[PDB]
Amino acid sequence: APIRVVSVPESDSFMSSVPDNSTPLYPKVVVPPRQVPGRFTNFIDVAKQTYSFCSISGKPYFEVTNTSGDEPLFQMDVSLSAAELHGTYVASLSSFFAQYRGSLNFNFIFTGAAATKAKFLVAFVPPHSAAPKTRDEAMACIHAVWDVGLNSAFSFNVPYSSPADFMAVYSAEATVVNVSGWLQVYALTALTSTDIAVNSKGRVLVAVSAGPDFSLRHPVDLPDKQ
C-alpha cells in the first residue's frame, strides 16, 4: 500500500533557482487586462533598438579644431566596463550578467556650425601593440573615413573577433578574453569655418547602439560597489 521513497541527502534545503514554483495559498484570483503600450519581454531587445551616449571626459562628445591632425581624437579599450562605455544603457545592462558576444556600433553626430566641415577618420585597433598614437600608425588597421557636410552624422561597426565564443562583461587585468582592443577616431583633416572667429570648434556625439549579433549570457549577482 504505502509507496517507498528515499530522500536525497540534500533534501530539506533551500535552492534559490529551483525550476518549479511553490504552494498556491490564494487561488482563482482573476486579474484585470492591461492596455499599456511600449512593453517588453527581452532586455537585449531594448539596447539593440536604442543608443546611449558614451561619456568622454564627462560629456558625450569630442571636439574638432583646425589645429589637430596627428593626435588621436578618441580612444578606449573595447570592454564593457572601459570608461566611455560606462554610462551607456548597453554597458549598464551588462552588469546583471557575466558574458557578452557582440560587435557594437557607434554613431557620430557632428554638431558644429552649419558653415563648418570637418572631414575625419575612425579606426579599430585589435589587441597587440600598446595603442598606436598617430593615424599614420593607426590607418594601417581597419578604419573608416568620413566627411561631414551633407551627411549630418555617421556609423561605425566595431566587430567581434577573438578565439573565445563569449567574453567578459567585466574588465580586469590584461587577459586574452577581457580586452577586444581599442576604438579610435582621428583628425584626417583639421576642422574649418566661415571664420575661425565665429566658429572655433565643432563637436561630435558618440552614441552606442548594441550590435546586431550581440547578446548577454549568464546572470550574476552584483559584487560590491567600487
Binding site: 500500500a1 504505502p2 509507496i3 517507498r4
Partner: peptide, 21 residues
Amino acid sequence: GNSGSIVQNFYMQQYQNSIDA
C-alpha cells in the same frame, strides 16, 4: 472494504493478500 485509495495495488495482490482457488 476500507481501502479506497489508488495506491493500494502498489504491491500486487499476491504479495498484498492471499488467494483462494
